[PDB]
Scaffold this active site. Structure first.
Site, PDB file in Angstrom:
ATOM      1  N   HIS A  78      59.204  50.531  45.728  1.00 24.13           N
ATOM      2  CA  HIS A  78      58.352  50.016  46.302  1.00 24.13           C
ATOM      3  C   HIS A  78      57.932  48.318  45.684  1.00 24.13           C
ATOM      4  O   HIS A  78      57.977  47.511  45.012  1.00 24.13           O
ATOM      5  CB  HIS A  78      56.677  50.454  46.827  1.00 24.13           C
ATOM      6  CG  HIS A  78      55.721  50.865  45.084  1.00 24.13           C
ATOM      7  ND1 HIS A  78      56.076  51.990  44.793  1.00 24.13           N
ATOM      8  CD2 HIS A  78      54.806  50.544  45.416  1.00 24.13           C
ATOM      9  CE1 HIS A  78      54.896  51.454  43.408  1.00 24.13           C
ATOM     10  NE2 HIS A  78      54.338  51.097  44.404  1.00 24.13           N
TER      11      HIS A  78
ATOM     12  N   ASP B 277      53.701  46.299  39.617  1.00 24.02           N
ATOM     13  CA  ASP B 277      54.713  47.230  39.226  1.00 24.02           C
ATOM     14  C   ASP B 277      56.046  47.660  38.799  1.00 24.02           C
ATOM     15  O   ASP B 277      56.550  47.366  37.962  1.00 24.02           O
ATOM     16  CB  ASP B 277      53.400  48.341  38.653  1.00 24.02           C
ATOM     17  CG  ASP B 277      53.842  49.248  39.499  1.00 24.02           C
ATOM     18  OD1 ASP B 277      53.240  48.798  40.518  1.00 24.02           O
ATOM     19  OD2 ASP B 277      53.786  50.702  39.567  1.00 24.02           O
TER      20      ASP B 277
ATOM     21  N   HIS C 123      51.888  56.630  48.850  1.00 23.39           N
ATOM     22  CA  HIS C 123      51.539  55.751  48.385  1.00 23.39           C
ATOM     23  C   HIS C 123      51.039  54.050  48.797  1.00 23.39           C
ATOM     24  O   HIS C 123      50.441  53.603  49.054  1.00 23.39           O
ATOM     25  CB  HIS C 123      51.673  55.606  47.043  1.00 23.39           C
ATOM     26  CG  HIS C 123      52.057  54.943  45.833  1.00 23.39           C
ATOM     27  ND1 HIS C 123      50.023  54.393  45.458  1.00 23.39           N
ATOM     28  CD2 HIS C 123      52.823  53.153  45.813  1.00 23.39           C
ATOM     29  CE1 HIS C 123      50.070  52.947  44.950  1.00 23.39           C
ATOM     30  NE2 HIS C 123      51.210  52.519  45.202  1.00 23.39           N
TER      31      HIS C 123
HETATM   32 ZN   LIG Z   1      51.892  50.845  44.366  1.00 19.65          ZN
END
Ligand SMILES: [Zn+2]
Length: 219
Positions: free
Chosen positions: A78, A82, A141
């Site tokens: 995504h 991170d 998410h």
């Molecule tokens: Zn995330």
């Protein structure tokens, strides 16, 4: 078998023969982020990069030195720091950054260099003898989150769509779709009936119980 850098901010532990989990810590309070390192007969393949280009460059050098191979591809799950944080480091090292078209455009809305945008809802890649399947289960998410499946090991990289066993917080839901998250985890469960290991975005590797755990938090 775990390998770390002198600082302790980066480590790589073996899950099995050619499957390792890489974890990096980003300050803010130090937060760990997981990803995969696949050792194939044709180079190293990673699932997600790290928080930034410094850590990402260091992670790459660490694994390249160890396996004496070059990282050829990376799968961005995504468009968050991170996972795509070191997108600039991958491109200048000739590393292919695979991602869905959506992840690609959200990477630019967020200020990151653009990934390939080549992954379809279901894409099967084979690096040497290493089989990988990327799956977009829908929004959760984030709007573009995907999971990675290694059919030969039945290992699932649920990523940030899946929370670890002791996590009681869903994390950032400013960009999430809380209500749909649950249906998306259900699509993953329906698709892969024989899951063994499940790797969460942050935390220790667990099993399908982690997906049931996340559905519980979403309730
Ligand atoms: Zn995330």
């Amino acid at each position: 078998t775990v390998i770390k850098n002198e600082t302790g901010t980066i480590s790589i532990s073996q899950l099995n023969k050619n499957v390792w989990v890489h974890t990096e810590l980003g300050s803010f309070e130090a937060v760990p982020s997981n990803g995969l390192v696949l050792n194939t007969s044709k180079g190293l393949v990673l699932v997600d990069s790290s928080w930034d280009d410094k850590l990402t460059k260091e992670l790459i050098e660490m694994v390249e030195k160890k396996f004496q191979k070059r990282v050829t591809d990376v799968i961005i799950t995504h468009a968050h720091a991170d996972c795509i944080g070191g997108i600039k480091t991958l491109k200048e090292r000739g590393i292919k950054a695979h991602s869905t078209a959506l992840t690609a455009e959200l990477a630019k809305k967020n200020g990151y260099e653009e990934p390939l945008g080549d992954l379809q809802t279901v894409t099967n890649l084979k690096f040497g003898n290493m089989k990988v399947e990327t799956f977009y289960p829908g929004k959760g998410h984030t709007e573009d989150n995907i999971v990675v499946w290694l059919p030969q090991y039945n290992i699932l990289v649920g990523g940030c769509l899946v929370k670890s066993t002791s996590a009681k917080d869903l994390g950032n839901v400013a960009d999430a779709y809380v209500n749909e998250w649950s249906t998306s985890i259900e699509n993953v469960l329906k698709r892969y009936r024989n899951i063994n290991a499940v790797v969460p975005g942050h935390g220790e590797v667990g099993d399908k119980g982690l997906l049931l755990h996340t559905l519980d938090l979403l309730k």
